[PDB]
């Protein structure tokens, strides 16, 4: 049985980083060399294994996490990194074994007035643990007085929205990301 990668990569809607998506991959066979040759995949870098030897291996269980960041934040989706995305949205462990894949999606995910559907968490009192998903919408208490569900002075919405216009630089453009985590399910 061939593996449902088309369901992941070619999906119609993509999640925002703070609420990233996570699909299981099990009991399947997959050809990774076809993927590795895609012109779309600006980033296709593995940790532990090498993309070349992916077809000759197999893994106990595989996860495909997927989300949308902006081009110059793709470098945070890697072990040992820091930044808003790596700290507060999606965190890889230092011992990560898997692959990070990213392609530019300027035509699907940008919009001339701005595409405000994609969000990321700006504020959090402490960093995310590896593979943690925080989806809290609670007003962020930046001062000693509580916020009582109303944003204001020292009381911020924890989620900000990307602008995503197609005319900005490549670092500002939306990139779709898929993270394959490898632990016999998928060979």
């Amino acid at each position, epitope marked *: 049985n061939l593996c449902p990668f088309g369901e992941v990569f070619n999906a119609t809607r993509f999640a925002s980083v703070y609420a990233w998506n996570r699909k299981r991959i099990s009991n399947c066979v997959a050809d990774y060399s076809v993927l590795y040759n895609s*012109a779309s995949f*600006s*980033t296709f870098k593995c940790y532990g294994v090498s*993309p070349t030897k992916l077809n000759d291996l197999c893994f106990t269980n595989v996860y495909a996490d997927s989300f949308v960041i902006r081009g*110059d934040e793709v*470098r945070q989706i890697a072990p*040992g990194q820091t930044g808003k995305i790596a700290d507060y949205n999606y965190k890889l462990p230092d011992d990560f074994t898997g692959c990070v894949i990213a392609w530019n999606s*300027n035509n699907l995910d940008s919009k001339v007035g701005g595409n405000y559907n994609y969000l990321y968490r700006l504020f959090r009192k402490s960093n995310l643990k590896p593979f943690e998903r925080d989806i809290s919408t609670e007003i962020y208490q930046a001062g000693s007085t509580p916020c009582n569900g109303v944003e204001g002075f020292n009381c911020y919405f924890p989620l900000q929205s990307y602008g995503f216009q197609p005319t900005n630089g490549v670092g500002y*453009q939306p990139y779709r990301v898929v993270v394959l985590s490898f632990e016999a399910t998928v060979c």
Partner: nanobody
Framework: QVQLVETGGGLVQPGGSLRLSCAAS????????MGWARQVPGKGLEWVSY???????EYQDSVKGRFTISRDNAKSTVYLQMNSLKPEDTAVYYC???????????????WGQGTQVTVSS
């Protein structure tokens, strides 16, 4: 911090060649890999060539044989020799570097401003 400047773009008539160069700055260029990509207006950004610190290269199949990626560590520079150009190849070409050092495979971590190449008639 990291700064990558592309030049060399311009007008070519079909069949002609073009040498693109990208000057690096803000990091030990000796240790990082380098890449060249291109965006067609309205189409997704696509990678064309990659070069590792070991000199190992990758060429994407749509530019196979015709392009040649190379590097001079002495001058922190990467080059892209475009022979046998077609109107399919007109785009804004970008130069790029790894984001971080670990790992195996292509990594377009930091981007240049880009230079336009246009195949004429």
């Amino acid at each position: 911090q990291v700064q990558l400047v592309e030049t060399g773009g311009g007008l070519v008539q079909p069949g002609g060649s073009l040498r693109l160069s990208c000057a690096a700055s803000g990091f030990t260029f000796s240790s990082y890999a380098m890449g060249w990509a291109r965006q067609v207006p309205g189409k997704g950004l696509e990678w064309v060539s990659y070069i590792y610190s070991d000199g190992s290269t990758e060429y994407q199949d749509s530019v196979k044989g015709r392009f040649t990626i190379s590097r001079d560590n002495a001058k922190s520079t990467v080059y892209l020799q475009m022979n046998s150009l077609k109107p399919e190849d007109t785009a804004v070409y970008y130069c790029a570097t790894e984001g971080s050092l670990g790992g195996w495979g292509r990594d377009f971590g930091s981007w240049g401003q880009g230079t336009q190449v246009t195949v004429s008639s």
